[PDB]
Amino acid sequence: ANAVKTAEGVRAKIEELKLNLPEGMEFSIPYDTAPFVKISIEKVIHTLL
Amino acid sequence: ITLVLAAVFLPMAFASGSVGVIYKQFTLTMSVSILFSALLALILTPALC
Amino acid sequence: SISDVNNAIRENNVEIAPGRLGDLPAEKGQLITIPLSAQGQLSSLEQFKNISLKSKTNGSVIKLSDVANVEIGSQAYNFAILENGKPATAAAIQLSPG
Amino acid sequence: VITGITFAGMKYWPTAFMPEEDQGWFMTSFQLPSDATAERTRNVVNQFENNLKDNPDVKSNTAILGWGFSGAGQNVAVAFTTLKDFKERTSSASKMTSDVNSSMANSTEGETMAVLPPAIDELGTFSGFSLRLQDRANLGMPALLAAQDELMAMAAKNKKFYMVWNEGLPQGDNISLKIDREKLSALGVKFSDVSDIISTSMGSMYINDFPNQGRMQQVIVQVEAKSRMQLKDILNLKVMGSSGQLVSLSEVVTPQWNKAPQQYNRYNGRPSLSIAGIPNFDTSSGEAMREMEQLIAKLPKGIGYEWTGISLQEKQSESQMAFLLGLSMLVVFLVLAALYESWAIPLSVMLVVPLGIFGAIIAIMSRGLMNDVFFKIGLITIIGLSAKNAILIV
Amino acid sequence: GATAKTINDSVVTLIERELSGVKNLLYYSATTDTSGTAEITATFKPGTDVEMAQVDVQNKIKAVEARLPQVVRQQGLQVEASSSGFLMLVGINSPNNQYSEVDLSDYLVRNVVEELKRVEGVGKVQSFGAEKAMRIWVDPNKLVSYGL
Amino acid sequence: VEMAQVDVQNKIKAVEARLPQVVRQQGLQVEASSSGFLMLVGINSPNNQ
Amino acid sequence: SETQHALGTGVFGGMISATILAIFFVPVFFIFILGAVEKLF
Numbered sequence: 001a002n003a004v005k006t007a008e009g010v011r012a013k014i015e016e017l018k019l020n021l022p023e024g025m026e027f028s029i030p031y032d033t034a035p036f037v038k039i040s041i042e043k044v045i046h047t048l049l
Numbered sequence: 050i051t052l053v054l055a056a057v058f059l060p061m062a063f064a065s066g067s068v069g070v071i072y073k074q075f076t077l078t079m080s081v082s083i084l085f086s087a088l089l090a091l092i093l094t095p096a097l098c
Numbered sequence: 099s100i101s102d103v104n105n106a107i108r109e110n111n112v113e114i115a116p117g118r119l120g121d122l123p124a125e126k127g128q129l130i131t132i133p134l135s136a137q138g139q140l141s142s143l144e145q146f147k148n149i150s151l152k153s154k155t156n157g158s159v160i161k162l163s164d165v166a167n168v169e170i171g172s173q174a175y176n177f178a179i180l181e182n183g184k185p186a187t188a189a190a191i192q193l194s195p196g
Numbered sequence: 197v198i199t200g201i202t203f204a205g206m207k208y209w210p211t212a213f214m215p216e217e218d219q220g221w222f223m224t225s226f227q228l229p230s231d232a233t234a235e236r237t238r239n240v241v242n243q244f245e246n247n248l249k250d251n252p253d254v255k256s257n258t259a260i261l262g263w264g265f266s267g268a269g270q271n272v273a274v275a276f277t278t279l280k281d282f283k284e285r286t287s288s289a290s291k292m293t294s295d296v297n298s299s300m301a302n303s304t305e306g307e308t309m310a311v312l313p314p315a316i317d318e319l320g321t322f323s324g325f326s327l328r329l330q331d332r333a334n335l336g337m338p339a340l341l342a343a344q345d346e347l348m349a350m351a352a353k354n355k356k357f358y359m360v361w362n363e364g365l366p367q368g369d370n371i372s373l374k375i376d377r378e379k380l381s382a383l384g385v386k387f388s389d390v391s392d393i394i395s396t397s398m399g400s401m402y403i404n405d406f407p408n409q410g411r412m413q414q415v416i417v418q419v420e421a422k423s424r425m426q427l428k429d430i431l432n433l434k435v436m437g438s439s440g441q442l443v444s445l446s447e448v449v450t451p452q453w454n455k456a457p458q459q460y461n462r463y464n465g466r467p468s469l470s471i472a473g474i475p476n477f478d479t480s481s482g483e484a485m486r487e488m489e490q491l492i493a494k495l496p497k498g499i500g501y502e503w504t505g506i507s508l509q510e511k512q513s514e515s516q517m518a519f520l521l522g523l524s525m526l527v528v529f530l531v532l533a534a535l536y537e538s539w540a541i542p543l544s545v546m547l548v549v550p551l552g553i554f555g556a557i558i559a560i561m562s563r564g565l566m567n568d569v570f571f572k573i574g575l576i577t578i579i580g581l582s583a584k585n586a587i588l589i590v
Numbered sequence: 591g592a593t594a595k596t597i598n599d600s601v602v603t604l605i606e607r608e609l610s611g612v613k614n615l616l617y618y619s620a621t622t623d624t625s626g627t628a629e630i631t632a633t634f635k636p637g638t639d640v641e642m643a644q645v646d647v648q649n650k651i652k653a654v655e656a657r658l659p660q661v662v663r664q665q666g667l668q669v670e671a672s673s674s675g676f677l678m679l680v681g682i683n684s685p686n687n688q689y690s691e692v693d694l695s696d697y698l699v700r701n702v703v704e705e706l707k708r709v710e711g712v713g714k715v716q717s718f719g720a721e722k723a724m725r726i727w728v729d730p731n732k733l734v735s736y737g738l
Numbered sequence: 739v740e741m742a743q744v745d746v747q748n749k750i751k752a753v754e755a756r757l758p759q760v761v762r763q764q765g766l767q768v769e770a771s772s773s774g775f776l777m778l779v780g781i782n783s784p785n786n787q
Numbered sequence: 788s789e790t791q792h793a794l795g796t797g798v799f800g801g802m803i804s805a806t807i808l809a810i811f812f813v814p815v816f817f818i819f820i821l822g823a824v825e826k827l828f
Binding site: 065066067069070 | 635636637
């Protein structure tokens with residue numbers, strides 16, 4: 001499976017659940033590897049151009 | 050030149066294991082880009098020049 | 099009755115469950131946790147022949163040896179082998195189709 | 197002569213699979229001794245949190261206590277530490293891993309090992325070489341465990357190994373209570389009572405569900421935590437007989453201590469333990485695997501090893517390179533010969549690729565980069581490039 | 591009711607043999623500890639179809655399922671394809687401190703875990719919290735005195 | 739043979755639901771064999787111990 | 788940087804050596820293989 005799309009879907013579902021979050025609880029994502037993916041590709045393209 | 054350059058990458062594409070997958074990833078782009086380059090050189094470059 | 103014998107064999111051979119010491123939730127200041135087990139199964143012939151059974155008529159405990167002979171033998175006695183007229187044991191090897 | 201030098205450089209220079217990378221996070225694993233409760237592991241993780249909050253590159257470190265890769269228990273913990281964006285850092289993850297390893301080896305009363313993210317996403321959970329030490333002759337669990345101890349003793353002294361350890365739960369001491377049925381009958385207490393009280397002394401018991409707030413939630417019966425901390429509480433449990441008196445368990449049990457492996461692993465059908473290590477600087481992954489094989493050769497009979505995960509693929513990559521090069525060089529030969537219908541042209545094209553290999557070999561030796569997959573793709577590419585150079589003139 | 595050695599003797603070795611024969615298998619391993627569960631793993635040659643591998647493994651398990659003990663059968667055996675590598679950690683903190691760990695865990699298990707495990711690409715959601723339940727903490731000293 | 743065995747197992751689990759509970763508990767064994775002995779391997783005791 | 792170096796240094800050195808040595812040697816190789824050719828015939 002694709003990491004970026006799965007992470008985006010998980011974060012979207014979390015955002016959906018932030019509507020019914022009872023007061024006093026806050027969602028957090030301390031650890032996430034998806035963000036690295038893009039920053040890698042963008043360097044390669046920088047070496048590409 | 051185009052044929053040899055496009056064909057030298059084929060054998061590594063068929064290796065086993067994860068290194069085989071990495072070789073496949075490299076070879077796809079390497080061979081297809083040079084074949085398209087051969088097509089472009091034979092077709093468009095002469096008239097454009 | 100046979101029910102009494104079966105129940106005695108069930109209870110005396112019980113298979114106590116394993117556990118642990120100092121498992122969560124734990125007291126403040128606990129520094130050691132150790133698994134612990136208890137053996138509750140009968141080991142060999144002697145204990146089985148010594149299984150206690152309450153006798154109705156006399157009112158005193160008797161032993162399994164009184165109402166049965168305990169031995170070690172084949173689980174099933176269905177089949178037998180004769181290699182050259184001499185008793186032995188054998189197993190047949192079959193091959194998967196293909 | 198150049199061809200000979202090229203072949204010598206091919207064979208001699210060490211090899212590896214992939215270069216390490218700074219992916220923005222690192223992983224710390226804490227494996228305290230089996231006797232350790234969760235409080236001691238929490239103390240160690242708190243020391244790690246204290247020692248990391250001072251650093252300015254720590255965006256956030258999250259610790260999972262009681263769970264870890266390759267084991268789960270009160271003496272196991274994991275921690276994922278992320279780092280600020282690359283441009284806004286004053287260090288690299290390797291330096292932070294080294295510092296945390298040094299401090300925790302200095303003082304935490306436990307084994308803590310900080311590792312970089314795995315070279316590839318899902319080949320393994322950390323970067324390094326992994327091994328499985330197996331008993332191939334039914335030598336017994338303790339015999340292979342002694343073999344593991346011997347292997348680690350040799351690994352520690354070796355200068356080509358930064359650190360090597362066992363990635364599994366450690367040994368443990370266990371207690372066994374043997375019931376005395378003769379005295380139990382003498383005192384007029386049934387064995388069923390003793391078995392039941394032991395069964396319901398130090399374990400949880402799920403009975404049934406109840407309807408809490410629209411969902412069925414379990415109902416669990418267990419003894420108070422104050423009565424299952426030490427052996428005294430168990431031996432102070434009392435059972436009623438027909439004599440009008442209570443007998444403690446201590447009267448009809450005798451604690452017996454044993455030392456047994458706390459975990460059981462198997463790999464390819466042989467009892468095994470899983471080892472991990474990092475190649476020291478100056479030492480490539482291939483050299484570390486080589487020396488680790490040399491040191492394993494000096495082990496009791498019936499003890500073998502098997503490379504798994506990243507190590508298996510690294511060995512496989514170097515176990516086919518000759519075949520890949522030969523096949524590529526045969527393919528180009530045949531294609532050129534068929535296209536040009538001559539024998540001089542293909543051989544002349546072959547008389548140049550030694551030089552292409554020579555250049556790359558000398559360059560990598562000059563810069564010190566090891567022979568890896570990317571180097572192999574480079575060799576394959578240079579084969580075609582040198583073929584193109586020879587064709588244009590021949 | 592079985593320790594690491596007991597559960598290893600009872601189930602792991604039995605399941606291992608039939609699993610050994612799956613197609614495109616690369617290696618197979620097994621892990622056992624006091625947690626009370628076995629964890630057999632089958633790694634397949636790179637490039638193999640994950641769904642085909644999973645269905646083959648399930649076929650070989652149901653082939654051997656008949657020979658396994660009744661207690662093993664009752665709880666059931668879970669066959670699942672995962673990556674054994676975390677993609678992200680999603681948590682619910684209480685900065686205002688109104689709710690303790692038990693309430694956070696019950697909310698996460700009841701609400702968030704089920705919602706997240708439905709999302710595409712989620713191989714498995716490993717929860718590090720437990721549902722609320724009524725716990726009866728029994729003092730054994732009173733039991734004997736009261737005769738219970 | 740493998741296809742036949744998997745098909746038979748599929749058709750048994752299809753009908754498994756309709757079978758009695760006692761039959762289900764012991765379990766049903768599906769196996770491919772040849773119904774012909776290849777060899778007999780035995781352990782004799784010539785010393786009669 | 789490490790990944791890019793591992794993929795670039797070898798190819799750079801290989802191209803430099805291949806071209807520089809080939810412009811001098813490849814004609815020699817062709818002449819010698821042709822020499823072997825008339826040796827055969």
